[PDB]
Design a protein around this nucleic acid. Structure first.
Ligand SMILES: [Zn+2]
Ligand SMILES: [Zn+2]
Lengths: 1129, 49, 67
DNA sequence: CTGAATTAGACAATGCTCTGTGGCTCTAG
DNA sequence: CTAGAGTTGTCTAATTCAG
RNA sequence: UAUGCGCAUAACGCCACAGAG
């Protein structure tokens, strides 16, 4: 193919020789690079954000100045470093470094140490530099700051980590939490869109407007909108601290440059010279500023600083000119750093707005992936870190404000900088984001989302665990909205997002996953040479004359910087030269550059221009450039103007420019694990991607080192005999999730209709699909048992008859031990008192203790009070457990059928799973039939067959191939055998299709789902039963059940279910005045009579029978002075 | 379902939106108003329609 | 994890054939011929040993005592 | 010198049941 | 040391136009 | 109200994620 290509080691077929290799189980000298690239976006974004983006971010924070009694005091941050996780100081250890296994088993946070070199100055002269500790920031595992960096797999085995361990996660309180990739708008690109809700925003606003998402070096993000008004005037929306401000365009364009008004005029009419409506409109916009006495740039800056100083909150000694410069730096086109470049980009956004509003270009779809990119974890980390550094400086100013209000004895600051200790500590506000996902900002960080930013990366199996690092989420705001247009599969996500791998239900179409070849640009390069390179080509500079009409030219954009203009007879030549330079790596053009040339059709197509993108966070995928014969990374917008080919046969000269690496590159990592997926119906492939991730498999290799809440383990998993080649590329036999089963497709028992399935009893009694679940309960005597005195330690009072031969002498169960219900679970004694308490085991499932680990605090000074018991619950397959094939065929076990009653073949073989053939016609999973024929051939010949999709055509069919294999093995061509009846003895007249299908055991068991409530706890407000099966509560008889039982005509059955079995209370009313609130019992002298408080007569009080919620109702209406009068007759 | 059904025919509102228009809203302005009158078999009527 | 004692489908003892299978495959037999030389005739028996992934050698690299 | 229709804003609704875990519920002044 | 990117679809308050 | 033996202990919401049909 191509050397140095990342996809050249993809195997031609699945082998099975690694399972029996003599070097199996010996850890390799180097980690498998196929697996390390699945989390490479996470790691490389965090590596940028912590080393280089942190230096750029602290250079971006302006020097913070404020007012003392007499003199201005300036604070600037010269440097900020994040240190790798070490032990606290004053800790006696042999190893200073902390590793993630400790923070994962002790349930701590794997924290770095942020410290900054803050400089301070009084009266403009720098008096001294302060190195100062700010807080502890979390560390992504296997970053440049993790202590597992650069270690071989033997050294990762030594430190209790996985061999072949990738890390894109944070340990936050012992929990692996991943920042999933959110979909953002395309950065630094004018997205012209139509939104009718913008018409409800001003007096004459139209539905047309150009959005813009400006990010500055991945540490700032500012959304801004131009709007179109019906008189041709443009308003400029900009948001500052989550609130919107509307400025006419002439003020911004006149404040950014010192140009004349005629020169600003010529930049806005530049394409459309003769459209006299635009000419009158932009002369009117320039006239608006002239009418308000702003004839120079300085007067516009003065006016804009006057009008925005209250909301903006500079010190009161800045001029108004500087206060407007502050808003143009914090709010307007922040990716640019020069004001003339802001002028030219803002003129381009206005010209695109004029072309949209005059019906001449088309709406950029915000839902198409062309106009979108990804939010990486390093970007969110670095934005939140820059905001917390700025807030830390403001907290120091508030500290001087408090010491000017309270301790104003006029002590000079002569290294009086232990007031930095009185500043805020940003450990807890930084960990709140990574611990909850909720974003508490004052800026909002340019996001449109406040929550769900961090998600638990749980490790149910490895197929689920890979899906957190490939997931691209659309937004949490979209699941609530009931529209079906953001949930569409659009064709512009060919090869970038997977078509099958998406959930079902509420997140269907929103929670998308990357394809296996797709990858996020995370490298950052210097693009200082690229505009001079473009001007060496035909791109005229933006000041110089373009030597042709601008109506016969293209606007050039290099990363949101408008470079210039190209003669349209030269622009395909420049685009091909840039693709040539990119794929041959010639003139320091990055290999991840998107060279988009949107052509001038003369029709209402997309807005034309030569757009060049080199920024990070874009999705990019490898194809092969057929003209050069080398592999090219093409982007999402770049793809829609290319004709890639899928197969060798589809390549035509002069038509197809590119070609995919392999035809199944449109699918996920996970969706490439479905055998023969082009023979299944597509919802049945979408169901398998979901239930392949719910499988009780083999999660991990470090069971004693892992302290997490539940952990589902399959006992003897098997490699699939029929699997795609991606199963062996990603080495998925390290963590296999299923067993091969001899599946016979027969209607034999009466228990397999309607999705149910039959398992051989004798296979289940041998080791078929047996399992375990490891529950880890972290017991802390400080946190839960808060009685006081802080001196609780695990232990027993010696001679206690509650713990004899049932807990050990440390008050903590034995490690071989079993735990039934009500057994002593742990014992703890109070040391300042002497009294020992015992805690009992309240779960209803018999477990076996696995290990007990005992934890200190971070110093090694903690006392014997934190412990983490891990228990094994058996969970072998029972009636009611759910299995699945690899094709979307889920099914509850209905019956464990004996082996003597099972239909035996002529080979002497029973099946171990019976499948009902009526799961095929409506679902059309033909790939399950091919998998059974292929698995039977693979077992018989001793092979391993390739089940990669799109390798079988109609000429060379799959059924012809595997039938010739079965014919060569002396079996039937069509997969059927002569079975006999195990109940009758007679040979069945039909010819029964049997094979080998690889089944999966899902984690949904009936032992976690049944519940029964006779009587029990009641809600303390309404006296109705409570909800939940862990609290042993009741189930609802809701409104639609009430309706359907009214339709039966059974009224005493509703009276039963909804009055006698929820809340039958007996209230006392005064029959005269009709009031529950009025009766009252006499204070005793017995007698026990009631008095109506209203009419003062004891005769009229009698009982009625009301719900208790009716009494709560009449009391809460009495709280609003509403009288409820009863007619009690 | 969005049946286009050519230009010469008509389309109405289908399904649950039309069922909601009939029942829950009782609107004076439905999305697809329509009348439907048969014509007479008179030759003078067919030359007039 | 570890080689099953019996085949799942029929009760044939297959647990005593794992080291023989590895010694046959290191002696340059085909996997079909190595399953024939062990007397695994039904393909139920034959997938038990053909598809066995032996996670206990990977799971004993984390052996605790290292002494 | 005042009833008139109109239009923008406010507001209320948007399937059902069930199972889990994890963080926080008064931290900032 | 105590403290606070929806979508219909009806109802009402503002908002202009000759008698 | 539940558990344990009249006695002792435990007596919950709100968000956000994930899932089942
Ligand atoms: Zn009374
Ligand atoms: Zn067997």
């Amino acid at each position: 193919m191509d050397p140095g290509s990342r996809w050249r080691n993809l195997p031609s077929g699945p082998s099975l020789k690694h399972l029996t290799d003599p070097s199996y189980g010996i850890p390799r000298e180097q980690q498998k690079a196929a697996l390390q690239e699945l989390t490479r976006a996470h790691v490389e974004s965090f590596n940028y954000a912590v080393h280089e983006g942190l230096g750029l971010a602290v250079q971006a924070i302006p020097p913070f100045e404020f007012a003392f009694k007499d003199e201005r005091i300036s604070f600037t941050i010269l440097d900020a470093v994040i240190s790798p996780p070490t032990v606290p100081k004053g800790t006696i250890c042999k190893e200073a470094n902390v590793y993630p296994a400790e923070c994962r088993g002790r349930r701590s946070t794997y924290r770095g140490k942020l410290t900054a070199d803050i400089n301070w100055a009084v009266n403009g002269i720098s008096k001294g530099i302060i190195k100062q500790f700010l807080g502890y920031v979390p560390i992504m595992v296997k970053s440049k700051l993790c202590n597992l960096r650069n270690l071989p797999p033997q050294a990762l085995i030594e430190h209790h980590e996985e061999a072949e361990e990738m890390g894109g996660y944070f340990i936050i309180n012992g929990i692996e939490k991943v920042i999933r990739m959110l979909i953002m708008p395309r950065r630094n690109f004018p997205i012209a869109m139509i939104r009718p809700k913008w018409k409800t925003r001003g007096p004459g606003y139209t539905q047309y407007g150009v959005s813009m998402h400006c990010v500055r070096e991945e540490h700032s993000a500012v959304n801004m909108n131009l709007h179109y008004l019906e008189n041709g005037t443009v308003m400029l929306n900009f948001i500052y601290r989550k609130e919107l401000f509307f400025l006419p365009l002439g003020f911004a364009l006149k404040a950014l440059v010192s140009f004349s008004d005629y020169q600003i005029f010529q930049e806005l009419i530049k394409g459309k010279e003769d459209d006299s409506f635009l000419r009158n409109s932009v002369s009117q916009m320039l006239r608006i500023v002239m009418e308000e006495g702003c004839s120079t740039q300085k007067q516009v800056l003065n006016y804009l600083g006057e009008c925005f100083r209250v909301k903006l909150n500079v010190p009161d000694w800045y001029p108004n000119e500087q206060a407007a410069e502050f808003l143009f730096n914090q709010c307007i086109c922040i990716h640019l750093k020069s004001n003339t470049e802001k002028f030219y980009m803002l003129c381009l956004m206005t010209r695109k707005l004029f072309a949209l509003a005059k019906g001449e270009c088309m709406e950029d779809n915000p839902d198409s992936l062309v106009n979108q990119e990804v939010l990486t974890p390093g970007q969110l980390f670095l934005m939140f870190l820059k905001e917390k550094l700025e807030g830390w400086l403001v907290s120091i100013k508030i500290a001087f404000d408090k010491k000017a209000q309270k301790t104003s004895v006029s002590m000079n600051t002569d290294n009086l900088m232990r007031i930095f200790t009185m500043g805020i500590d940003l450990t807890k506000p930084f960990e709140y984001l990574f611990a909850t996902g909720n974003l508490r900002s004052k800026t909002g960080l340019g996001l449109l989302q406040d929550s769900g930013l961090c998600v638990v990366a749980d490790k149910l199996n490895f197929i689920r665990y890979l899906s957190h690092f490939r997931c691209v989420h659309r937004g949490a705001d979209f699941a609530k909205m009931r529209t079906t247009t953001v949930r569409r599969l659009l064709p512009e996500s060919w090869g970038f997002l997977c078509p099958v791998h998406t959930p079902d239900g509420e997140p269907c179409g929103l929670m998308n996953h990357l394809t296996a070849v797709c990858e996020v640009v995370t490298q950052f390069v210097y693009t200082a040479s690229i505009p001079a390179l473009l001007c060496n080509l035909g791109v005229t500079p933006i000041d110089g004359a373009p030597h042709r009409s601008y109506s016969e030219c293209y606007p050039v954009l290099l990363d949101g910087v408008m470079v210039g203009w190209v003669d349209k007879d030269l622009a395909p030549g420049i685009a091909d030269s840039l693709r040539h330079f990119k794929v041959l790596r010639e003139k320091r053009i990055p290999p991840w550059m998107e060279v988009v040339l949107i052509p001038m059709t003369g029709k209402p197509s997309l807005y034309p221009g030569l757009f060049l993108f080199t920024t990070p966070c874009r999705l990019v995928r490898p194809v092969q450039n057929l003209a050069l014969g080398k592999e090219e990374l093409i982007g999402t917008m770049e793809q829609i103007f290319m004709n890639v080919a899928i197969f060798e046969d589809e390549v035509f000269a002069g038509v197809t420019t590119h070609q995919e690496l392999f035809p199944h590159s449109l699918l996920s990592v996970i969706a490439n694990f479905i055998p023969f997926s082009d023979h299944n119906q597509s919802p049945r492939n979408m169901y398998q991607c979901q239930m392949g991730k719910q499988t009780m498999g083999f999660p991990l290799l470090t069971y004693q080192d892992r302290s997490d809440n539940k952990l589902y383990r399959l006992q003897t998993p098997q490699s699939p005999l029929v699997r795609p080649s991606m199963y062996d590329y990603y080495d998925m036999d390290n963590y296999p999730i299923g067993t091969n089963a001899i599946v016979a497709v027969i209607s034999y028992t009466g228990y397999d209709m309607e999705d149910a399935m039959i398992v051989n009893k004798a296979s289940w009694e041998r080791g078929f699909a047996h399992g375990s679940v490891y529950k880890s309960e972290f017991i802390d005597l400080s946190e839960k048992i808060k009685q006081g005195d802080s001196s609780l330690v695990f232990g027993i009072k010696p001679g206690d008859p509650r713990v004899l031969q049932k807990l050990d002498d440390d008050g903590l169960p034995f490690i071989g031990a079993k735990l039934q219900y009500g057994d002593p679970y742990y014992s703890y004694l109070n040391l300042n008192t002497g009294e020992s308490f015992v805690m009992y085991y309240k779960s209803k499932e018999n477990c076996v203790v696995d290990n007990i680990k005992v934890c200190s605090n971070d110093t090694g000074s903690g006392k014997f009070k934190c412990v983490c018991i891990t228990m094994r619950v058996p969970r072998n397959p029972t009636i009611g457990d759910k299995f699945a094939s690899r094709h979307g065929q889920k099914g509850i076990l209905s019956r464990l059928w004996p082996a003597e009653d099972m239909p035996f073949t002529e080979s002497g073989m029973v099946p171990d799973i019976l499948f009902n053939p009526h799961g095929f016609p409506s679902r059309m999973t033909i790939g399950m039939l091919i998998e059974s024929m292929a698995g039977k051939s693979a077992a018989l010949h001793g092979l391993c067959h390739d089940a990669t999709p799109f390798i079988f055509s109609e000429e060379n069919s799959a059924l012809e191939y595997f039938g010739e294999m079965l014919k060569a093995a002396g079996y039937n061509f069509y997969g059927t055998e002569r079975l006999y009846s195990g109940i009758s003895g007679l040979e069945l007249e039909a010819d029964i299709f049997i094979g080998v299908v690889y089944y999966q055991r899902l984690r949904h068991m009936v032992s976690d789902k049944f519940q029964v409530r006779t009587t029990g706890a009641r809600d303390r407000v309404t006296n109705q039963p409570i909800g939940g099966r862990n609290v042993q509560g009741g189930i609802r008889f809701g409104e639609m059940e009430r309706d359907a039982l009214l339709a039966h005509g059974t009224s005493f059955l509703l009276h039963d279910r909804l009055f006698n079995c929820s809340d039958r209370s007996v209230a006392h009313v005064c029959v005269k005045c009709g009031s529950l609130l009025s009766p009252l019992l006499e204070k005793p002298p017995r007698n026990r009579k009631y008095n109506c408080t209203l009419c003062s007569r004891s005769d009229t009080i009698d009982t009625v029978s009301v719900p208790y919620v009716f009494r709560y109702f009449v009391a809460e209406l009495a709280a609003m002075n509403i009288k409820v009068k009863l007619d009690v007759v | 379902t969005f049946h286009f059904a050519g230009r010469g025919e008509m389309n109405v509102t289908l399904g649950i939106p039309r069922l909601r228009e009939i029942l829950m809203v009782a609107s004076a302005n439905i999305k697809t108003p329509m009348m439907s009158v048969p014509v007479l078999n008179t030759k003078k009527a067919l030359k007039r329609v | 994890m570890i080689i099953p004692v019996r085949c799942f489908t029929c009760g044939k003892i297959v647990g005593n054939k794992w080291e023989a299978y590895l010694g046959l495959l290191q002696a340059e037999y085909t996997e079909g011929d190595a399953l024939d030389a062990l007397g695994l005739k039904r393909y139920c028996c034959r997938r038990m040993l053909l598809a066995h992934v032996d996670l206990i050698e990977k799971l004993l690299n984390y052996a605790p005592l290292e002494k």
